[PDB]
């Protein structure tokens, strides 16, 4: 029966793994520890904007803005773990893109995922007692924004340093995936080779494939708290961590050539 530990959460902290795999993950800036004024404001209830009510100090908004323009004007904000993917409705263009410090705050303040990071980070830890969390400090992660096609994003599962399974992150059908799926399987398997320096033998890494390059996006624990997507967690448990080939799951949906290419394989069944 699989369990979550204090250090499994600690290692998944953006700073904790970015440091290790900088060359493997797209450009970001980490403000650690998070400015007290920004944290203070973050904990206040309701979303107050300056455009008797607390708003972060001029020093903080200048520092966030300094990071933004240094990352080419547009960014994607995060705390130690969760991205505000749930709060796209508050955003001005329906994406995690942030050109201003206000846009950043608006996203972080209205996100339930960000809120989980703030008061539910160790809600399943056997090693920790949620009473008030060691040499730990919250961080504001600012990742350089880019047009990311949600089709070529994959969630990859790892048990005892072996690639167990991987699946599509989106929930739409893409016909062009089954065409390159063998090449992605190579790309993602070859990236895990470079994730050997990671401290946990069981983890879940998010990846983004663009121009024959499998980009690391995040790392989350091998625990049901982290969404198993197209795979069930009982399915992921009931899986060989010593089997040479991993299970792939894509979203489900002609020529004489196609038809009889299929025959050739249907003939190959009768044989072996």
């Amino acid at each position: 029966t699989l369990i979550l530990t204090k250090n499994q959460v600690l290692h998944c902290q953006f700073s904790s793994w970015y440091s290790l795999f900088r060359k493997l993950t797209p450009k970001a800036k980490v403000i650690k520890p998070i400015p007290a004024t920004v944290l203070k404001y973050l904990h206040e209830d309701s979303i107050y904007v300056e455009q008797p009510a607390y708003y972060p100090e001029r020093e903080a908004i200048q520092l966030i803005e300094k990071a933004i323009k240094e990352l080419g004007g547009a960014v994607v904000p995060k705390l130690n773990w969760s991205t505000p993917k749930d709060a796209l409705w508050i955003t001005t263009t329906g994406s995690l893109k942030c050109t201003t410090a206000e846009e950043v705050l608006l996203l972080l303040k209205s996100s339930d995922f960000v809120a989980h990071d703030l008061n539910h980070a160790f809600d399943d830890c056997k090693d920790f007692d949620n009473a008030d969390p060691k040499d730990f400090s919250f961080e504001l992660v600012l990742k350089e924004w880019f047009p990311m096609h949600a089709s070529t994003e994959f969630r990859c599962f790892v048990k005892s340093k072996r690639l167990i399974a991987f699946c599509q992150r989106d929930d739409n059908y893409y016909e062009f995936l089954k065409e390159n799926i063998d090449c992605y399987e190579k790309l993602i398997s070859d990236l895990l080779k470079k994730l050997d320096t990671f401290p946990d033998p069981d983890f879940v890494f998010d990846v983004y494939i663009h121009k024959d390059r499998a980009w690391l996006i995040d790392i989350n624990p091998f625990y049901p708290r982290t969404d198993g997507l197209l795979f069930s967690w009982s399915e992921l448990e009931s899986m060989n961590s010593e089997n040479m080939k991993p299970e792939i799951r894509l979203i489900p949906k002609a020529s004489e050539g196609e038809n009889l290419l299929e025959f050739a394989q249907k003939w190959q069944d009768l044989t072996n």
């Binding site: 107050y48 300056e50 001005t92 608006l106 209205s110 809120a115």
Partner: protein, 102 residues
Amino acid sequence: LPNIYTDIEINYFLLRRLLGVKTDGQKQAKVRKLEPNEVLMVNIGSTATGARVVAVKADMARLQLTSPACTEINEKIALSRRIEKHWRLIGWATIKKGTTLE
């Protein structure tokens, strides 16, 4: 009469306390006066958008949405506030006036 509105003027009403029944028997928190330069979450039909409060009179308030919404005048709206890191329903409204993108 459906259009794409950027800012809306609403006729509202708030709840006195938040929804729910605390097990200790203690009353739910009293819903406070909607203050200006507060970003609420408005449910305008299927659309869930953020709206900044620019002014308040009494049973009337003008809201500057975060991105444009598709509605008609007299549509029923649901006002929500970030309380204890939850989107909690505070009240309801009707669009009486609204400024379009075109």
